[model samples]
Target: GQDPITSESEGIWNHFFVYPMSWLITTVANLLNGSYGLSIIIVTILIRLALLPLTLKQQKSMRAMQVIRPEMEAIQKKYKEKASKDPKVQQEMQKELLGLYQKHGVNPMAGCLPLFIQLPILMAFYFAIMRTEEIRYHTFLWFDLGQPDYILPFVAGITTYFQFKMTMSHQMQMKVMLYVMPVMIIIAGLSLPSALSLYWVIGNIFMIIQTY
Candidate 1:
């Protein structure tokens, strides 16, 4: 009979998409430190670094958004100039903004696009953690990532909140959403495996440094 104290299942996550990279990471890690936990950290760094160009592009776009806030506000203030709250004016404003963006060679969607492009890799990491049986049960400090450790999740939430607060626009509208996103993520993260959460936290912290 199977033991009552079972570990996280590595079934779906240990598949082709996740397994190969995880295997490579694990192999290199074991070879280097003879420890898997440190290996995961290194792999996470590698993955984030591999996507640095996109991260830089996103940071540049976000900075552009911040830079254009004044202009955006001016547009809003001039809203009454157009005919009776005209939708046409809105469209034209958007067109002008697009032109301005082009002039600056700044794509407003640059930030989001890079993040969107990285979703697959993030997913791959998630599944890899889920599938790596040995890595799952691996413990460090007070965190038992194989299980839903509340401490790490809470820390992740708090760190995420601060990260967004630091990076997001100062506008009230943007600020509100920025704050909301962290809370929402925290709620979502509560259900995730601790190992994944640990990885996510590390990834986020790394991004914050890189963005700076």
Candidate 2:
């Protein structure tokens, strides 16, 4: 009953997020004499700039995590078995954790907010590329923007691994991430279009620069 271009669901995402980005990408590419790859890089940079405050907050939250690690470990040591065996001990442990966090003015949850915020923007770019015929059809260097490529996927994976390693504090979770996250990025990049892979590569580069 409905074609994709005029479909209701498509229209909603296009109206809210995708179309704006599509327009920006097109406009930027036009200014650069129709270089879609450069446009993606520029758009990625602009998005990172817009998210700079949130990134700073995330960094601050991670620093807070580092600062609290000693106390957190001490709590774990103090409650090793009692937290699992008794409800009252668990409650006391939670109370102590809360007090410690408040005393330090730290929010463990704040570190995740930037990722939450950026995810929508990432999806918006995804949809923008999907919806814009010009962008999808363009070629940058040897790869088609709409098609997948091997090189960028590996680049994305390697950059993600190093960027994550630099930013994450040493812990069991970070150790898990050191292995898991890059593999996930590589796998995701392999399945997505080259444009998305390029975005990830550029975004990770920006993050790497910011982290150091």
Candidate 3:
């Protein structure tokens, strides 16, 4: 029961993501003379760097969308009056928006890649810290890596709030996201092991730097 990886409920994710992440963190911590906090920071940066291309692509797509926003708004304005008057006008407007998207070579959905790709990695790291007994017993600075901390969750929430505020183009429309992300981060961080919050805080700091 002490070793989760060798246990009976092990699945493919445990082998592919969880086990590897666990090994990486453990090895890194050992290399650093058992500094688990520094290990998490280093590993978080490595993961972010590994996913840099997806982040860049997502940024590029956002810039492209911003570039075409004026034209998109004009198209919406042109169709707004007629769309309310007739159903055929609504269909035409949708067709025109699709054509505009194609012409700009901007898949509105392309920006989703970073979020999709990072989620599994985050989850894997979360479970890795949980499943690894060594990490669970380790302390990093002010708190135990496997236990929740009072301050780090707020730090995570604040960093994520700033990260979202910096990257988002339209504040009004994204007002919900601006508030929601920080709340979600705080809630999740408080609910999970502090190690995961540390991972998130480090990741958000990286994202904030990337945003600028």
Candidate 4:
């Protein structure tokens, strides 16, 4: 009843993005008999289930990249100085690169589909958690659903590592990402409002299980 995310609140963002999420978070919490943490967890899994096709799309893109890698690397190596040294050559490189992907049936933007789709929803959920009052007052097991805590963030980070650890191909870049990504999750988990940290953890574990 308090802290209504009114039409005036954050303007178009809340209206178009956060408002429905606020409704959803509360609705799920209502169904779960008033535990916001379980609401977060339930919604997280449902969102992942909803996003499953994008996961496969992104995975298919990853596999596409592997098939394209050697030929693309050759082009880069072949044009190493030409593209950088001449404007006309740069045009040629771009044309060639586009042609390569087209010839190979790979859309360069294919992999970004999941990130592009999920970012707004994730941001909306973050705002939903913060603005919805029921979630703020509720606690689940070890901690407050609204306030930050230590162990949960650690769990978020560890699960992130495990999810990718089991799933990644051992490209050198992938190896670098293995550590880099986990630390980044830990950083976000440390300061991100509790529900979002829980959100991250739930998604990670869900992906871990799904991928396995």
Candidate 5:
């Protein structure tokens, strides 16, 4: 039989966010022959699917930012010395930039809200995996859910690199980023439970496919 995490000790944020996600993993596991790994994969896919609108919106915002980049460069060029020299001139530069953004119906920071919304949800899912006790006892394929393995970490690392390589611009700065991401993910997988790493692996695969 599966166990329940008593919510009495948790705060309001946990009650609203983490427990709901934790419940979904358990509930989905219950329905699917008791494989929490599969449950996590399904839930991650659904979460990603639900978040498509926000992701697309953020991408659209990035595209619009690129469209306005040339004009912004011109404005910044003209205001460069004066804005750098004085506070009042900096404010004037900002005002002109705001007017330009408004004229083009593009807000430079519009994508921030979507990114902010995403981080908490992702963190909640990680907490869900950590706090869900049954998953720790379950074994999937060659590894115990709560234990670490070398292979999946490598897969997670490679997929992490490949996903970024596919989507991101291959500029010099971004090349450094692509190199950095996989190592960070591999380190993350090594330190975290295998269940969490499996989630990362599946999530990256889904995202990579979506970009195609």
Candidate 6:
């Protein structure tokens, strides 16, 4: 059974494993500045800066996708009519679309490249937050991160929703799921610690900057 009260070990494990450098930087900075919030802010900035190149590449790929959407649409329209009637045409159409994408060097999945690269790091951050005790009872302005306070989680969810809205095309099915994802996340956050939510809020804000 899960205890309502969290342990120092829990807090420390999350900080140590998920964000080792951030945990180090934050710990050292907290010794000086005496605020975990400040440490989080600094670490978020550092991570964002480190990932700037990948973000830019992703943005460029997105822009290219926007440019090529019409071409892609034409291909789809031309082939969609035959998809049920002829398997040969479907395969040929797929081959042609692949060639087009290859020629432009614009893989549709390119926009997801940065995220794919970061998923492991993000998972580590999640674990670190779950285990770290330093943040268990840590206080920030108007909030404590160890408990399920709605503020940070909601903020994280909203920021995530906004970021997704900005990145996803209206034509995408994900736009519909964007609303759903945040709602689900907000619900999950009710069970999650605030430190994890705080990390996400900072991380998302940095991502919004990286997008621009």
Maximum-TM-score candidate: 2
On lDDT, who's better, 2 or 3?
2
Q: What is the lDDT of residue 55 in candidate 1?
A: 73
Give the C-alpha miss distance for residue 120 in model 6, angstroms.
2.3
Better of 3 and 4 by TM-score: 4
For each candidate, give its TM-score against the true structure.
0.75, 0.88, 0.85, 0.87, 0.84, 0.76
Maximum-lDDT candidate: 2
Per-residue accuracy of model 5 over 1-212 as CA lDDT, tens digit each: 43444444457658878999999999999999898878888998888898888888887787788788789988898886553767888898889999988997887756888768766787888787777878776889988777777788888889888888887742565767689878988898898778777878888998788888
Identify the runs in model 6 with alpha carbons over 4 angstroms from their true place.
1-22, 31-33, 83-87, 164-174, 210-212
Sort every candidate by lDDT, greatest first: 2, 3, 5, 4, 6, 1
Query: Model 4: how far is 112 from its true place, Å?
Result: 1.5
Judged by whole-model lDDT over C-alpha atoms, candidate 5 comes out at 0.82
Instruction: Evaluate all candidate structures by whole-model CA lDDT and list the values in order.
Output: 0.71, 0.86, 0.85, 0.81, 0.82, 0.72
The stretch of ten residues in a row with the least summed lDDT in candidate 5 is 1-10
Model 5 scores a TM of 0.84
The TM-score-based order of candidates, best leading, equals: 2, 4, 3, 5, 6, 1
The reply for model 3, stretches above 4 Å from the true place, is 1-10, 77-80, 83-88, 168-170
Give the Cα RMSD of candidate 3: 4.4
lDDT of 4 by residue, 45-163 (tens): 99998899878789878988988889888889989855386788878888988998889788885687677888888899988878887677577877777777778888888888888
Q: Tell me the TM-score of model 2.
A: 0.88
